């Protein structure tokens, strides 16, 4: 019951952010949960976490607990982390699964491809089938050295969602296959997922709050320049890849929305060294205690302020004709794509 | 707006649990709160707690704070624990009331039968009546050595709800009158009340999670066998009585539902000894640290899992034709009775 | 969809409190939030906090974060505490602002009259105006030595809301201009704002819970007598001023409702001495540890009790014909005024 014009933010030069209801309303969220996050490829991890047989990880997004597991046969698969019998969760955290997944409730065992191996007493229950009593899968794809899932089984590949992205990311960082997760920050954030994307898409505050060109592509954008290149990739719907100068490491921001005003964030820092140099250990500390706190306070305060009847519905996107670094035109592009799911 | 067929689970051999909405929906809960828990006899305590004049207890169920009190005249009564003047609560916890109940707000005093004794300045207020300014009662019955309340004042007795139960319980345990509460575990549990009953009604997991026959009766069931007999009584709507081998003590599980995904549980352990033997003190510790944690984790994980779009609506009730101990047919009987309130 | 007769409580001699829904319902609250608190003068502070240039305070009411600030030019102003750019909050707590208000996000600066002074890069954004990019004001008035705001910009003055109040308050306390805030108690209270007003409007319990005449006026009442006079002012919608015997100090109760069952309360204690006498420091301790706890427990227990189906809808307002100190007739007057917004 809450819609937007199609030309919304099509012209970045004269554009305003969403009406406030799109940042706060439970009905806008449930629509986006089904129309966007249930039908789009969602990035969940770098490939290093899932590189070896029996390696698995677990993730929560839009209230779906997901397990991604590298099979004994080295095939990467993803399932809903819920037992098909009576609904117990199957696995927790991350690590190396064993050769079978045993449900902690009634001890049904599944192969690592989801196949029900043994369900106790099953051959004496009437009208039971081993198949169709399997763990329920969803699509998974390795792309650009990262791992994407999709809850729509008719989905086509990541490349159809992010045309050109993988080729450009490999041109930004040539050692992505060699990266290892050196630190992760988990934060449940009281801000709508679109508020967090807004913050990322702009460099109006890189100096008053923390050689610059922001170019839009098909469902992704890139913030590029020289500082020694630096890259900042935003990709639909909300995963950000940073390649700081030197191009030898990455940080990735994963957004796992929970509800209209809550978002789970993973802030991952990837280096190529197993043992960190002191420069890297110090850099992790600067990210945890300085940089990321400043960013989270910003979106939290903004989430509070925009509910106020004193915030007049929308806010002005500060685009300049020359598209300088402090131009907010990236926001306009993102909100235009979002408007397309609200016609 | 969420209904069920009448033959739902009438045939245990080919049966599935409820659609997931009945375990999660606030509208299913409010309907069950009024149609089931406001019109059924609810077990709240063993008779020992209320055996002496002025003994009282307090209980919370479906958001109703109840007081049960043995009158000075030795008559057992139950009232809503709310002052009829402006709504302050009257009593807290349990113990021995005094000869009058004095409201902590404006100090109206009531006899232990709810009769307003003194309301300050009342004879100068126009159109006031002492009677019809009393504490508001509800039905209470002592049955099977336990205490049952009912919020429907037109209710008939417990026996019409649980035909045969008291006779069978006395055949399971002959010293019920002599039992004393040796320990109580209070836990607010993030699981729908029907999930907790499901867990109790099955012995599919007594070995992989913690001479067996489960027979259904009129609104109650019994899990029976030899291990020296052992008994497990489920009674409508959700109170469970355990009589472990030796038949000399009992544990009782009381379920006081709060909302669609929350249930208050009392786990009571009753012995006949005032001073416990070391075997009993150790047994209380095994129940608190081992047994009950395992049970609560099970239902909590199940409550989370069944919301997942990966849990395909319902789950298969694993009944075998021979009705062995690991047969889940008890669940089918319970869900059939519940379906009867959702036509 | 929840209304009241107009003669509701017009006759204090035969009157009952509201039906329970008006104390609990989110729909009754949202209506009162817009019809009452968005259109009425709301008291927020004593004038001493805002007496000097650049002095400011912040307040939360009905989910609106407000800033009141004495301009460099000594003019008192109030604004919504939200940046007009993208919605960050501007200021926090209380104290002395600087000559400009700099938004912590993108560093737009505002004059202390809300005027946008500098918005970085603004002259290169198309169709931008400095004016109409200002902080959004609301009405503020100094009245009776206290500070009132109003969110309706077409409002007339406080005097039209509280006719006679300021003249009577100055007759109760002659040194209001000289008062200094000696202590504040902040408590988020789980009780509807109308429950807290009910508690204040009565002296049925001044003796069983903690020369007396309660006279009603236009939107305010006064509890008066000798104990050496004492005064107790209630004013619409919910601010209470106490002038204890000796008339040399005041306590003020501010009610900032949050939702149907939550109210933020400030309990302010004002003396004329900058350095407190031991009698005053002890009196602050008696208020914090004894008096106010008793009052907050009362309304919290009442909020719980009135939801119970055992509380029969309404409660009797105990008015006597002679209108003695323990007469509850003040409540009737307040609820009659409230009924006028629920026709
Ligand atoms: S819930 Fe997993 S085996 Fe029963
Ligand atoms: S609320 Fe119990 S006497 Fe007034
Ligand atoms: S939000 Fe205040 S300057 Fe951008």
Residue numbers in the entry:
A (entry chain A), B (entry chain A), C (entry chain A): 4 to 213, 224 to 240, 256 to 371
Published text:
For all three structures, the Rieske [2Fe-2S] cluster is well defined and coordinated by two histidine and two cysteine residues. Structural determination of CntA revealed that the two functional domains in CntA (the Rieske domain and the catalytic mononuclear Fe domain) are located 44 Å apart in the same subunit. As such, electron transfer to the catalytic mononuclear Fe center is likely to occur only at the interface of two adjacent CntA subunits (12.2 Å apart) and facilitated by the so-called bridging glutamate (E205). The E205 residue bridges the Rieske cluster on one subunit and the mononuclear Fe center in the adjacent subunit.
The carnitine monooxygenase (CntA) and associated reductase (CntB) responsible for carnitine oxidation to TMA was originally identified in Acinetobacter spp. but was subsequently found to be present in a range of gut microbiota species. CntA belongs to a large group of non-heme-iron–containing Rieske oxygenase family. The oxygenase component has a conserved [2Fe-2S] Rieske center coordinated by two cysteine and two histidine residues and a catalytic mononuclear iron (Fe) center. We observed a head-to-tail α3 trimeric structure for CntA, with the Rieske [2Fe-2S] cluster and mononuclear Fe center at opposing regions of the monomer 44 Å apart.
